[PDB]
Design a protein around this ligand. Structure first.
Ligand SMILES: *[C@@H]1O[C@H](CO)[C@@H](O)[C@H](O)[C@H]1NC(C)=O
Ligand SMILES: *[C@@H]1O[C@H](CO)[C@@H](O)[C@H](O)[C@H]1NC(C)=O
Lengths: 51, 34, 101, 49
């Protein structure tokens, strides 16, 4: 739940379900940049042609 | 006694768009809009 | 441009030209973004190709560290650089002297 | 990146999990987690195994 990409620490002492930061931060940055690029309204106002 | 790897780069580039980011710094950029 | 056309057909022409302008502008933006992404991916792929090709040429004699530099165990001189550069190097000649490191 | 960090200390089994030969404690977990691990401290112990 902390990050997308995590680690399974098997030290024969416990179970460390850690999470990375760099790669998942790059992935979230790229995906939110993709949505900032695409999810946008039009910049041209149209007109009603038919009736 | 070693050999390293690398690529050419410039001090000042041009910011271009891409599929997942805005204003990515690259080496060279041509103009597609006259 | 000089003498104005009939208003209804002029509005139809402007609406069609504006829709075509929107389609071509979106197509140009998607085209530029797609081929910039493909050019960046192509550069990364060619760098990865060169890195793995040098790794296959150097074999077990040089161990990668995680930087792009190769720690060649043999005393690999300038002619050895030329051999690993222009696809001439053989690992079987130097494995005996580079195995103990 | 983890493969480049673990030079000879660990190998890929085939299922994608590294098998560290030497003793790699929770501080070594943290070192490979935040990329501060070094091969200069455990080349020989992992090489002898
Ligand atoms: C970059 O592209 C331009 C074309 O717009 C070209 O004239 C130039 O030689 C290229 N290289 C550099 C280093 O500017
Ligand atoms: C169509 O658009 C042009 C501008 O591109 C404008 O000058 C012209 O008046 C428009 N036509 C009509 C019928 O309004």
């Amino acid at each position: 739940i902390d990050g997308w990409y995590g680690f399974r620490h098997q030290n024969a002492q416990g179970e460390g379900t850690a999470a990375d930061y760099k790669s998942t931060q790059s992935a979230i940055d790229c995906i939110t940049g993709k949505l900032n690029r695409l999810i946008e309204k039009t910049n041209q106002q149209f007109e009603l042609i038919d009736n | 006694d070693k050999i390293c790897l690398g690529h050419h780069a410039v001090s000042n580039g041009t910011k271009v768009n891409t599929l997942c980011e805005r204003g990515v710094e690259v080496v060279n950029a041509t103009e597609t809009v006259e | 441009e000089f003498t104005e056309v009939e208003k209804q057909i002029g509005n139809v022409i402007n609406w069609t030209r504006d829709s075509i302008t929107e389609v071509w502008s979106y197509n140009a933006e998607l085209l530029v973004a797609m081929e910039n992404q493909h050019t960046i991916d192509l550069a990364d792929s060619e760098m990865d190709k060169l890195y793995e090709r040098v790794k296959r040429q150097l074999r077990e004699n040089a161990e990668e560290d995680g930087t792009g530099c190769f720690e060649i165990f043999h005393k690999c001189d300038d002619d050895c650089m030329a051999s690993i550069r222009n696809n001439t190097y053989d690992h079987s000649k130097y494995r005996e002297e580079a195995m103990q490191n």
